[PDB]
Design an enzyme around this catalytic site. Sequence first.
Site, short mmCIF file in Angstrom:
data_model
loop_
_atom_site.label_atom_id
_atom_site.label_comp_id
_atom_site.label_asym_id
_atom_site.label_seq_id
_atom_site.Cartn_x
_atom_site.Cartn_y
_atom_site.Cartn_z
N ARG A 125 39.92 -24.01 -36.55
CA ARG A 125 39.60 -23.04 -37.60
C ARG A 125 38.51 -22.07 -37.14
O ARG A 125 38.66 -20.84 -37.25
CB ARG A 125 39.16 -23.80 -38.85
CG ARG A 125 38.99 -22.98 -40.12
CD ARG A 125 38.65 -23.87 -41.31
NE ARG A 125 38.43 -23.15 -42.56
CZ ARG A 125 37.25 -22.72 -42.97
NH1 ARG A 125 36.17 -22.90 -42.22
NH2 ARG A 125 37.14 -22.10 -44.14
N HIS A 159 36.86 -14.79 -45.27
CA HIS A 159 37.37 -14.85 -46.64
C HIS A 159 37.74 -13.48 -47.19
O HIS A 159 37.78 -13.28 -48.40
CB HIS A 159 36.39 -15.57 -47.58
CG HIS A 159 36.06 -16.96 -47.13
ND1 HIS A 159 36.84 -17.65 -46.23
CD2 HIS A 159 35.01 -17.77 -47.42
CE1 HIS A 159 36.30 -18.84 -46.00
NE2 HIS A 159 35.19 -18.93 -46.71
N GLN A 172 42.76 -20.03 -48.49
CA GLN A 172 41.31 -20.09 -48.49
C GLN A 172 40.70 -19.12 -47.48
O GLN A 172 39.68 -18.50 -47.74
CB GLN A 172 40.81 -21.50 -48.19
CG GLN A 172 39.32 -21.68 -48.44
CD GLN A 172 38.70 -22.75 -47.55
OE1 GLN A 172 38.97 -22.79 -46.35
NE2 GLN A 172 37.88 -23.61 -48.14
N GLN A 184 28.90 -23.42 -43.58
CA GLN A 184 28.07 -22.73 -42.60
C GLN A 184 26.77 -22.23 -43.22
O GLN A 184 26.76 -21.70 -44.34
CB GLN A 184 28.85 -21.56 -41.99
CG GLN A 184 28.15 -20.87 -40.84
CD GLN A 184 28.58 -21.38 -39.47
OE1 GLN A 184 27.83 -21.25 -38.50
NE2 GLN A 184 29.78 -21.94 -39.39
N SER A 225 33.87 -23.67 -48.55
CA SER A 225 34.57 -23.22 -47.35
C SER A 225 34.85 -24.38 -46.40
O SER A 225 35.73 -25.19 -46.66
CB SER A 225 33.78 -22.11 -46.65
OG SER A 225 34.60 -21.43 -45.71
N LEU A 226 34.10 -24.47 -45.30
CA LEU A 226 34.19 -25.65 -44.43
C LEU A 226 34.09 -26.93 -45.24
O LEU A 226 34.81 -27.89 -45.00
CB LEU A 226 33.10 -25.61 -43.36
CG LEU A 226 33.01 -26.78 -42.38
CD1 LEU A 226 32.23 -27.94 -42.97
CD2 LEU A 226 34.37 -27.24 -41.92
#
Length: 307
Positions: free
Chosen positions: A115, A199, A248, A9, A90-91
């Site tokens: 998600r 997170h 994660q 992102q 992340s993604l």
Amino acid sequence: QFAFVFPGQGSQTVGMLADMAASYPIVEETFAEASAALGYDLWALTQQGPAEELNKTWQTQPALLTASVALYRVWQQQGGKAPAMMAGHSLGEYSALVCAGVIDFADAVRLVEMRGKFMQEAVPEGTGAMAAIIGLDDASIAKACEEAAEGQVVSPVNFNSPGQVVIAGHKEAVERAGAACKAAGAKRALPLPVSVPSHCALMKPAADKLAVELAKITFNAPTVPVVNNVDVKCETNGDAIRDALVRQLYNPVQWTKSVEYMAAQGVEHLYEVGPGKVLTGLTKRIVDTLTASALNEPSAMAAALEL
């Protein structure tokens, strides 16, 4: 030896990949596959926006994963060799896992849409915040967050490079932590266009929902090592990877240590296989002798395929 890294992102923009798509039909073919899974035209979203739609996380995530997979497919189609290792932010981890053959592409598109929805619903708008802490060491920040929490949640959530760390949590605690970081000598503590406090512990119940969905999806062995965000480990157990995606979601992204780890295995260059140059820019800040460049423009793609 090179690795591929995959952004998350923030790296999206309206019009991204336009040039590449005009040079490589496989790009829109890939987006057409994603769009079938999603029930809307993802390419059109990326090309027309508006930005506010593209930036909604349950749409951002599939957009980004698809962009990355499209670029990987161009690389492979034009004869490029597999990278020695992959990692994603992340993604981006999902993108890596698709390109390493662990998750079916369409499955992953649906997965990251869910998600993003789980993330969006985690707390009420106005409950969470993120902040960038600039110019303070990892340890001092973790301590500032401890002192500041006072029974709310705030913690480091992105270790992006030495001197660039994002914290997140409940808004009041992030404010307190920010102030503490400044007091401890941080150059900035800049509040971000957040909402979703990714997170950190606030994402647990979202992770628990995600785990349910991940379980439905087949995971295969990776054909290329993928260094994971949560543990900085190259898991191969289909069920261990799946399991690392759950953790994660509510634990910090260890990007700094992941880039160090790749360098330690002999990686010399990182190619950023996604829109933007965010991970590219981090690279020399982490290991000054590493080089990095992006593969989202036709010419750069050509130049890498010549090597």
